[PDB]
Amino acid sequence: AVKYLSQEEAQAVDQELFNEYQFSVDQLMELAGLSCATAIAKAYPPTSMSKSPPTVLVICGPGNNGGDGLVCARHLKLFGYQPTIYYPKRPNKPLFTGLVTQCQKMDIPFLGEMPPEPMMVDELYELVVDAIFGFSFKGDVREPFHSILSVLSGLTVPIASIDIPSGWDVEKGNPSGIQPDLLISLTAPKKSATHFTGRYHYLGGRFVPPALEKKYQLNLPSYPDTECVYRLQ
Amino acid sequence: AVKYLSQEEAQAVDQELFNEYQFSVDQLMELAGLSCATAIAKAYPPTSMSKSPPTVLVICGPGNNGGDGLVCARHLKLFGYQPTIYYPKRPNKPLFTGLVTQCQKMDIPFLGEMPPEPMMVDELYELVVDAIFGFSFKGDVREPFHSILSVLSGLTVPIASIDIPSGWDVEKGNPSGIQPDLLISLTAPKKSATHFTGRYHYLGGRFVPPALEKKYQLNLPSYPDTECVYRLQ
Ligand SMILES: Cn1c(=O)c2[nH]cnc2n(C)c1=O
Numbered sequence: 306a307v308k309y310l311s312q313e314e315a316q317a318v319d320q321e322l323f324n325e326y327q328f329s330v331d332q333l334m335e336l337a338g339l340s341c342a343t344a345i346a347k348a349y350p351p352t353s354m355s356k357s358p359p360t361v362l363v364i365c366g367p368g369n370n371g372g373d374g375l376v377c378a379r380h381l382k383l384f385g386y387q388p389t390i391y392y393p394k395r396p397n398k399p400l401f402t403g404l405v406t407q408c409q410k411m412d413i414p415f416l417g418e419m420p421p422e423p424m425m426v427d428e429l430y431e432l433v434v435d436a437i438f439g440f441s442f443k444g445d446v447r448e449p450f451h452s453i454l455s456v457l458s459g460l461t462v463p464i465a466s467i468d469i470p471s472g473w474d475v476e477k478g479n480p481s482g483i484q485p486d487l488l489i490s491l492t493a494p495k496k497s498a499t500h501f502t503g504r505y506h507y508l509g510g511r512f513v514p515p516a517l518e519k520k521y522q523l524n525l526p527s528y529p530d531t532e533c534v535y536r537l538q
Numbered sequence: 539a540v541k542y543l544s545q546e547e548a549q550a551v552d553q554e555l556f557n558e559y560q561f562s563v564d565q566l567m568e569l570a571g572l573s574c575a576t577a578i579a580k581a582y583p584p585t586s587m588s589k590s591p592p593t594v595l596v597i598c599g600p601g602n603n604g605g606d607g608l609v610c611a612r613h614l615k616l617f618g619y620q621p622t623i624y625y626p627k628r629p630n631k632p633l634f635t636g637l638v639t640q641c642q643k644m645d646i647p648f649l650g651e652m653p654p655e656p657m658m659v660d661e662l663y664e665l666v667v668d669a670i671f672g673f674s675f676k677g678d679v680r681e682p683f684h685s686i687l688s689v690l691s692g693l694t695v696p697i698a699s700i701d702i703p704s705g706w707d708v709e710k711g712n713p714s715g716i717q718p719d720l721l722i723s724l725t726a727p728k729k730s731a732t733h734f735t736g737r738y739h740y741l742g743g744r745f746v747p748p749a750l751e752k753k754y755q756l757n758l759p760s761y762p763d764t765e766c767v768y769r770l771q
Pocket residue numbers: 315316318319320322333337439440468491492493
């Protein structure tokens with residue numbers, strides 16, 4: 306069966322990838338974000354949703370998970386969804402300034418603020434994508450993210466979390482945290498994923514060189530044909 | 539029906555993408571190379587090939603098409619193929635030095651030279667990927683590419699060309715050029731694709747913002763579900 310990583314194991318795999326294999330940051334981020342988008346479309350495809358086009362709020366954090374979120378949003382657009390992004394804290398680097406402009410001229414909107422009540426979120430959006438915190442998260446959940454997460458736990462619409470349900474401890478989880486319905490584990494799942502009890506768990510990030518998989522004994526399952534995601538069960 | 543571009547139209551679409559939309563070079567190159575790999579796997583999937591794992595020679599040029607080739611090779615590896623790269627002329631930039639190392643630690647080999655007879659190519663490789671020249675090609679086909687193309691036209695195994703059959707005039711074609719069996723048109727097809735008479739023509743590069751498609755009246759067909767390629771016929 307497939308292996309679930311420690312924060313330490315995953316920080317290590319990630320640094321091989323950029324330092325040894327010399328994969329570039331935005332290369333992998335593109336592929337990670339595509340997988341997210343691809344998991345969401347397979348779990349909640351347009352035909353099955355009530356709105357044509359189905360609506361989605363993508364909430365992006367201040368670090369790389371936020372980045373994956375921006376990329377996901379843009380592929381969601383192309384896959385037939387009507388996404389909206391809340392990106393309250395934006396790092397000033399070209400990486401992120403470029404992902405912002407791309408989404409803008411796709412006509413994907415950026416909310417100036419978070420709807421403060423879960424019911425309004427539920428009414429506006431058929432799905433919320435949690436791209437706030439990922440693998441390297443150590444916090445200390447500070448504002449404005451505490452109250453975002455507090456709105457999220459009152460939602461009736463599904464939450465799709467990228468890599469790690471934000472607010473959960475990367476290894477241990479959080480019983481009183483948000484309880485997503487879809488989780489996209491990128492590269493390899495993290496021990497906190499054994500606490501996941503939603504209906505959909507996909508593996509994404511089809512870019513792990515087989516010698517890395519053999520080295521860290523990841524026992525990655527075989528993605529089918531040309532797919533960039535695989536449903537874990 | 540879908541539109542076929544002039545060199546001038548495509549140089550323009552490409553420069554919007556990087557200058558206006560601020561898509562990054564390696565972002566799109568990743569997605570282009572993934573589509574190539576995905577077209578090849580759907581046209582010539584492992585189960586249908588005689589070797590397990592099916593073998594492939596990817597021939598990379600000195601410019602961006604070569605880049606797409608390197609990316610294709612690496613996804614081909616993950617998709618279940620045993621690729622080999624001939625990259626005789628290598629630009630010294632991180633972009634390309636990184637794509638080279640990635641392939642190396644995937645255990646994808648780089649030929650020191652081209653097999654000089656088509657029969658040897660046919661015996662070693664079940665498929666040849668032509669990533670030599672693409673859209674911005676103006677040449678003046680110089681060495682060592684003249685003799686590569688001259689080996690290629692004597693092949694019995696299929697050739698898969700990325701974007702433009704190398705040696706063909708980007709608009710007009712070339713009746714006495716190489717005659718690929720698969721063509722992957724990236725972003726949008728080029729007028730030379732109306733001269734293509736092989737069995738497989740896929741469109742790839744699922745990243746065109748709809749307002750660009752509407753502006754340059756590309757009439758892009760609808761890629762199905764989450765696929766990054768579409769078969770044209
Ligand atoms: C292990 N690992 C991850 O868990 C992850 N999540 C997002 N990018 C990631 N990368 C690049 C990674 O190597």
